[PDB]
From a paper:
Overexpression of K26D or V51D mutant PduAs resulted in no higher order structures being observed by TEM in the bacterial cytoplasm despite the proteins being produced in quantities suitable for crystallization and structure determination (see results below). The lysine 26 mutant is the most important to study structurally because Lys-26 is conserved in all shell proteins and contributes significantly to the interface between 2-fold related hexamers in the native crystals. Two crystal forms were obtained for this mutant using commercially available screens. There is clear electron density for residues 4–89 in nine copies of the PduA subunit across the two crystal forms, and the C-terminal residues, including the additional 23 residues, are not seen in the electron density maps. In both crystal forms, the regularity of the tiling is lost in that the K26D PduA hexamer no longer has strict 6-fold symmetry, and the separation between hexamers is greater than in native PduA sheets (67.2 Å). In the first form, strips of hexamers are formed, and in the second, sheets with rather poor hexamer-hexamer interactions are seen. It is perhaps not surprising then that no structures are seen for the K26D mutant in the bacterial cytoplasm when PduA K26D is overexpressed. For one of these mutants (K26D), crystals were obtained, and these crystals reveal more fragile hexamer-hexamer tiling than in native PduA in one crystal form (type II) and only one-dimensional tiling in the other (type I). The mutation K26D has a profound influence on the conformation of the neighboring Arg-79, such that this region of the protein no longer adopts a single conformation in the crystal, resulting in breaking of the 6-fold symmetry axis of the hexamer. This results in the imperfect tiling of PduA molecules seen in the crystals and apparent lack of tiling at all in the bacterial cytoplasm.
Residue numbers in the entry:
A (entry chain D), B (entry chain B), C (entry chain F), D (entry chain C), E (entry chain A), F (entry chain E): 4 to 89
Amino acid sequence: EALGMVETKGLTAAIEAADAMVDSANVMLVGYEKIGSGLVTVIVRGDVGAVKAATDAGAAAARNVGEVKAVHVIPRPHTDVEKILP
Amino acid sequence: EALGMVETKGLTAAIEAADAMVDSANVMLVGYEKIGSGLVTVIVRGDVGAVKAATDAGAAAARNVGEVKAVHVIPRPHTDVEKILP
Amino acid sequence: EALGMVETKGLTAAIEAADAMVDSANVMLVGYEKIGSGLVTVIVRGDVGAVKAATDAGAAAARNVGEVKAVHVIPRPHTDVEKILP
Amino acid sequence: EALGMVETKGLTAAIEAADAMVDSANVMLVGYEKIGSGLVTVIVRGDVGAVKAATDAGAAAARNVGEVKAVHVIPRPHTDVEKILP
Amino acid sequence: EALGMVETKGLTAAIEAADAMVDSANVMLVGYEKIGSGLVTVIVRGDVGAVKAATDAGAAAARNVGEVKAVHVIPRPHTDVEKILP
Amino acid sequence: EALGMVETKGLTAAIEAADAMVDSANVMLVGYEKIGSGLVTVIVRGDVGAVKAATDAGAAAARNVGEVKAVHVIPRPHTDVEKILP
């Protein structure tokens, strides 16, 4: 099941993008990851359609609050990637 | 209950925002987070009114001391958001 | 009791603040906190008069060494803020 | 065996690179390394042909998400270097 | 018990400063501290005259190799400052 | 014995420096250090000639992959300096 990622500079922008991503026809919040330098990545999992819609809504929400750095969907992620997710 | 956040660049400004918010209204200080690049977010919970007054006061007190980067209120935060809060 | 904070760019200016502050007066050096972007916050506790004199003395001294980003005293922080302080 | 590294600005680009790499060939995902200013290095091991396939796949995928900082393959790292690798 | 500090951006410049300061009557190398962001402070202890000379020589040598951010001596450090040294 | 360091901005350029260094001369790779802001130091030990050959070769290989921030040799490091090396 697909993975939506929204990365911001700023935690308030990340919390808002998360809030905005989980209403959703089945996407749950996995968590966020800090890599230092003010950069926060929020990660959701769900079916590709709601995930695509959810990550778009996250980026638009976060953009109101802060700086959005990356927006991305991985529709069919490999098993091995799991081991690098929060 | 509602969620409030004030994100500052600087820890001194954040501690002032925190102290100003809890004296301004019936909110509870949930905690603060650091994400690097000098970014510190303080987070409060309470009803939507008290969180709105608390953030405005916390922003205003922080601005007297340091840089405020974001002020935001989530009036009805989704259950999944509990996951990623201090 | 009272809270004093001198925030500097770089560790050398923070060591200088700390030394000036604990020399100053009857106050306890708690330590310092890193928040990224080279910022270091020095934290002391003591009676309000000493913490006032000490943060004055710390800021003055740090300024001779490098950049002082913030200086603040909170005479009587709220109990919930105490929970989040270093 | 060979060593493959793709280095990106940000975690969202690094996760894309990582997914693309393990998906594209018979390589083992080691993990990733944070080094500050937002830079993340993804590291993979496998035979030289697959590592060349995977680092190519990884870097082209990541360019669509964010900035790629380095792309490199070491067919046969020295023993002393094996010692210091993730 | 005087304290010499040289703060560099970059570890090579710091190692070079350390090696140039200790060649010196009695000044001993205390250690170095990283605060993130590329910033390293080298700290020496010894008598005031030899520490002033050591830190001037260390800053000169470090500037040959990298960027020097602060240079400072505290002639008579308070005993509580030891708490925040590496 | 002599001391060689190459400091890169980027982990990928540092691994390349380390590999090129030990394939260049009779050096031991002591290890690498991270200090934030993308800066990685690779350190080698050996007689002065080899350490000079190695750092030149490590620098030259890293530059084909990323930025080199510093290249330095200490031919006769003070014994005090061994305490701060990895």
